[PDB]
């Protein structure tokens, strides 16, 4: 205590006295003015720094496909499910293999492939396993495949001599991630997830509760309609496969730890037919995207090996992590032609945390819902009328740009946008993204500050933009949103000018 004291006084008692017998004079006015002169604190104005140097963006290789699964290019394999056969969910593929799947085999010579032979062998090991049992009977191949590695350890005690006698070239270094540039494919991915798929619904939603006239009629109606719109979308498809498959793995970690297992990449959907004819039924089924392999390692992050079918030609710029093969030819048809099949392969890391949060993807619906619903109430609450139904169809939301012209869609279809946006937020979540948004909010607030002419100000915009820049590394979404905020700032500057355009 007696040497913990701050003041020139050393004995506690003296500090005690100055405290107890304290009466402060008005010298803090002059102390504050001198503090101010020394401060040179920045009295900032918004009109002056309104430019914000637009937004800084990184230059290098185009960012890759960080999502554990491929969406747009991914290919499906339909199967009409049995309640008792499918129930296993692990037998789904076993029953699939009796179909055409067994036929498909890739050539040794692959397009854009990083470790061909390994992946080819493994594919064979999967196919062989499926016949007997969905487990890979490997003790040694497992270790390598995990590696594609361990580092043998050395005691400090014995190490002192090898410092004195430097051998094995002793050193210490850490590494950083390489920055990437704004993706192009992302826009196309969003445009594909937005549009409705032919299959009707993917995310398993429960029944509806009994209704009283007053409130329940409203809630029940709104939900049935919104679910109706969003279940048809491809975004929902990917939500489904995510939930079902990550669920399947989450079971497999308890079922067979320290074991190698073959898990399918599937999603369940029922087809809906409204031709106005009495059809046999709306089609009830489950479709497959590809096969997946578990490897328990490290508690900690699991190592996973994804294999997806596709009908589309691979793009080196975005599929860099992916290793492509030429698999064969698959039939596609319609009536009011078989296209070659490519097999995309990769490896990735799954934290148990990521397994959990990605498994519960349904959450995204909710954050859309609120966001949507609020708009309808706030609007209708003005006219004190039921304007929900009217507002959904009439109220126009700015969705995109085409031919240099600002486009807008009704709230019901621009709903898909928010949903996709929330789904991506789920998938593409990196500490980068977190920092991005949590600093981006300041931008948005300054923006609306300018909208309603509130004459804002930001103290060190260079510093803010520096933190924004800092959190932008190699995150497709993060960067995408950056570039889209640029275009925002632009069009906004054009409407009312308290911003810059280069």
């Amino acid at each position: 205590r007696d040497e913990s004291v701050p003041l020139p006084f050393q004995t506690y008692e003296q500090m005690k006295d100055y405290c107890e017998k304290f009466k402060g004079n008005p010298r803090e006015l002059a102390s504050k003015v001198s503090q101010m002169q020394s401060n040179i604190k920045l009295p900032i104005k918004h009109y002056e720094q309104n430019k914000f140097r637009q937004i800084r963006l990184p230059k290098g290789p185009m960012a890759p496909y960080t999502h554990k699964f491929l969406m747009e290019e991914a290919w499906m394999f339909t199967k009409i499910s049995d309640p008792e056969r499918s129930r296993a969910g692990e037998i789904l593929i076993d029953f699939f293999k009796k179909g055409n799947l067994s036929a498909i085999r890739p050539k040794d010579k692959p397009l854009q492939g990083k470790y061909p032979i390994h992946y080819k062998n493994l594919w064979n090991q999967i196919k062989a396993a499926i016949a007997d049992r969905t487990m890979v009977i490997n003790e040694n191949d497992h270790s390598e495949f995990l590696g594609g590695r361990a580092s043998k350890k050395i005691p400090e005690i014995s190490l002192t001599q090898d410092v004195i006698t430097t051998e094995g070239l002793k050193q210490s270094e850490n590494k950083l991630p390489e920055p990437r540039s704004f993706p192009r494919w992302f826009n196309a991915e969003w445009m594909w997830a937005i549009k409705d798929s032919d299959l009707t619904g993917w995310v398993p939603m429960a029944e509806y509760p009994p209704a009283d006239n007053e409130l329940e009629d409203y809630a029940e109606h709104l939900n049935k309609t919104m679910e109706g719109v969003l279940q048809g979308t491809n975004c929902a498809r990917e939500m489904g496969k995510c939930i079902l498959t990550v669920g399947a793995l989450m079971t497999e970690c308890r079922l067979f730890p320290g074991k190698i297992k073959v898990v399918p990449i599937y999603a369940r959907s029922k087809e809906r037919k409204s031709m106005q004819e009495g059809l046999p039924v709306p089609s009830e089924m489950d479709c497959l995207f590809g096969i997946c392999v578990k490897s328990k390692s490290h508690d900690g992050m699991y190592t996973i090996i994804t294999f997806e079918f596709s009908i589309r030609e691979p793009n080196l710029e975005k599929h860099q992590k992916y290793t492509v093969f030429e698999a064969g030819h698959t039939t596609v048809r319609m009536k009011k032609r078989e296209v070659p099949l490519y097999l995309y392969c990769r490896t990735t890391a799954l934290s148990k945390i990521k397994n959990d949060w990605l498994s519960k993807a349904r959450r995204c619906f909710i954050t859309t819902m609120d966001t949507v619903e609020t708009i309808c109430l706030r609007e209708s609450a003005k006219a004190e009328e039921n304007l929900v139904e009217k507002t959904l169809n009439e109220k126009q939301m700015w969705i995109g740009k085409k031919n240099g012209e600002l486009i807008a869609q009704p709230l019901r279809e621009a709903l898909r946008v928010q949903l996709v946006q929330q789904f991506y937020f789920c998938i593409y979540n990196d500490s980068q993204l977190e920092g991005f948004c949590n600093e981006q909010k300041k931008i948005l607030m300054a923006l609306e500050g300018d909208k309603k002419n509130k004459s804002s100000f930001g103290f060190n915009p260079e510093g803010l933009l520096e933190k924004i820049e800092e959190c932008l590394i190699n995150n497709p979404m993060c960067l995408f949103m950056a570039q889209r905020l640029n275009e925002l700032v632009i069009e906004a500057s054009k409407r009312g000018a308290k911003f810059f355009k280069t």
């Binding site: 007053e214 409130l215 148990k352 945390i353 609450a381 004190e384």
Partner: protein, 550 residues
């Protein structure tokens, strides 16, 4: 029979272990409260994940072996294993599905009546919902953001310590302290509860835990929309929020809500009794309190334990409590109005001015509560510095304005002299001169033109554009043609402050409580209701009310 034996043998075993033996001997029993706290059941890092992980395996759950052995088959109907002999605890493991099976095919009868009255709380909160009508519309609602209002109200609600006493007595007798205060006075509820729950030994811990909740109004800080009855509170969410509204609700309420008001009237009369004789106000009122006996809808209960421990603090109730040792601060009463203090401070000073007077010179900012109307005021140097009204009905706004002006006490206070010297001046109560604020107060409460007088005493100006919505008319409208000075209305309600505080001090000889070394909280006589109507109410000891024949 061996049930008591094996326990003894266990004790033998434990006290043989010297380590456990010494910790069992040293110190009080209170150590158990600490000892139990040295065991968390398990790690709680990843809740939802842990559970999803848990149920994934087929046989994880811990379960009770003996009872299942006694009543039902351990084997399955579809030949999937259900039971083993493998184990440290006496509880043997089993699958999840079995539980569902006994629910289906288990042999059991006649438990229905036993259940409900155990959770009369929850079950009643259901019952109430049946009896109501419905309607639907939308609006940009302005809700009342902060009311510390009782939710989940139940008859005979009480404090935590006392309810703990009840808990003990009803659950068991074998280990209960002979607690006097609650048992002697509130017996009868003791009878009822103890009778229904002691006889049929089931769920000993659970019931206790739910009775604790059964008499505990959850007085949270919540946003309401005008319906301030503790019954609509429980299910506000379905009734509204900022853009929702529902209808036909006031009707079905528990018998409590009106009973509290009855107790307010009780306190009214009991205070009029002490008012009547000013030889002493301290030694007499206390008598009228402890003597009087209340009769609740299903119980006889003393007036003391109701007053001391009532949630709602009315101007009367304040006075009633003041006699006893009941700390209920944060409450300020002035006539019919209720107030809260939020800013600064200053001293009581004496100032004689031509119509002695007590004036405060604080730059103090306070909150105004009146029927259907809320507001914010700030006074500095005996005059209102800042003012804003968030009322609903025009009249009640005007009333607010007035009352707060009285408490404010400007120079114009003195200027208005119609009568007063004749009647209002001296109060006909053993020749007692009544305080001056309350004098002008009563003068305004007298007639309709008396309100108009001081309403005009304030500066009146044609308000400027930009104050069209804010400006207050004399009649209480938002027209802004002509309006009062140092005042602006607010399109919407005004939030109410809250403080977790307890303060108490003795009262003066004229029903005044100078609590917190001043502050004049007691307001003398709030309302001069000269009426004497009572129902199922007890009184005693020369009550000065004649109900006693020879």
């Amino acid at each position: 029979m061996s049930l008591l034996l094996t326990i003894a043998k266990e004790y033998k075993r434990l006290c043989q272990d010297a380590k456990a033996a010494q910790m069992m001997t040293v110190g009080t029993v209170s150590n158990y409260t600490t000892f139990k706290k040295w065991t968390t059941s398990r790690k709680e890092k990843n809740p939802s994940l842990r559970m999803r992980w848990a149920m994934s395996s087929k046989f994880p759950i811990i379960a009770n072996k003996r009872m299942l052995e006694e009543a039902q088959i351990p084997k399955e109907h579809n030949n999937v294993a259900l039971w083993e002999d493998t184990e440290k605890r006496d509880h043997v493991l089993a699958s999840a599905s079995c539980i569902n099976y006994w629910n289906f095919c288990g042999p059991c009868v006649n438990n229905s009546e036993v259940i409900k009255e155990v959770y009369k709380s929850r079950f009643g909160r259901l019952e109430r919902r049946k009896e109501i009508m419905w309607k639907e519309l939308r609006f940009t609602l302005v809700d009342r953001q902060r009311r510390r209002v009782d939710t989940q109200p139940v008859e005979q609600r009480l404090r935590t310590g006392e309810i703990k006493d009840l808990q003990m007595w009803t659950l068991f007798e074998d280990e209960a302290p002979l607690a006097s205060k609650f048992i002697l006075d509130n017996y009868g509820l003791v009878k009822e509860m103890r009778s229904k729950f002691a006889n049929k030994p089931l769920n000993k811990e659970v019931v206790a835990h739910m009775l604790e909740k059964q008499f505990n109004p959850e007085s949270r800080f919540l946003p309401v929309f005008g319906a301030i009855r503790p019954e609509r509170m429980e299910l506000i969410h379905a009734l509204g929020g900022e853009t929702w509204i529902q209808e036909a609700n006031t009707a079905g309420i528990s018998n409590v809500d009106q009973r509290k008001n009855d107790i307010r009237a009780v306190c009214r009369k009991v205070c009029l009794a002490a008012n009547a004789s000013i030889m002493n106000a301290k030694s007499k009122l206390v008598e009228y309190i402890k003597s009087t006996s209340m009769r609740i809808g299903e119980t006889e209960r003393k007036l003391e334990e109701l007053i001391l421990e009532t949630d709602d603090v009315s101007p009367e109730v304040t006075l009633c409590k003041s006699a006893l040792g009941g700390q209920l601060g944060k409450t300020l009463s002035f006539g019919p109005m209720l107030l809260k203090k939020i800013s600064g401070s200053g001293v009581k000073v004496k100032d004689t001015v031509y119509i002695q007077f007590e004036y405060w010179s604080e730059q103090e900012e306070f909150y105004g509560e009146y029927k259907s109307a809320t507001a914010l005021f700030s006074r500095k140097e005996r005059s209102l510095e800042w003012i804003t009204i968030g009322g609903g009905i025009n009249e009640d706004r005007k009333r607010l304005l007035a009352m707060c002006m009285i408490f404010c006490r400007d120079g114009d206070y003195f200027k208005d002299a119609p009568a007063t010297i004749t009647m209002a001046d001296l109060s006909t109560k053993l020749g007692r001169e009544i305080p001056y604020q309350y004098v002008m107060m009563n003068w305004i409460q007298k007639s309709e033109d008396n309100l108009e007088a001081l309403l005009y005493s304030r500066g009146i100006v044609e308000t400027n554009p930009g104050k069209m919505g804010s400006s207050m008319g004399i009649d209480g409208s938002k027209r802004a043609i002509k309006s009062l000075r140092a005042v602006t209305i607010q399109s919407g309600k005004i939030d109410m402050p809250e403080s977790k505080e307890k303060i108490h001090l003795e009262l003066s000889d004229n029903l005044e409580a100078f609590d917190s070394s001043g502050r004049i909280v007691a307001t003398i006589l709030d309302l001069p209701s000269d009426k004497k109507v009572t129902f199922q109410d007890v009184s005693f000891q020369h009550p000065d009310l004649a109900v006693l024949r020879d």
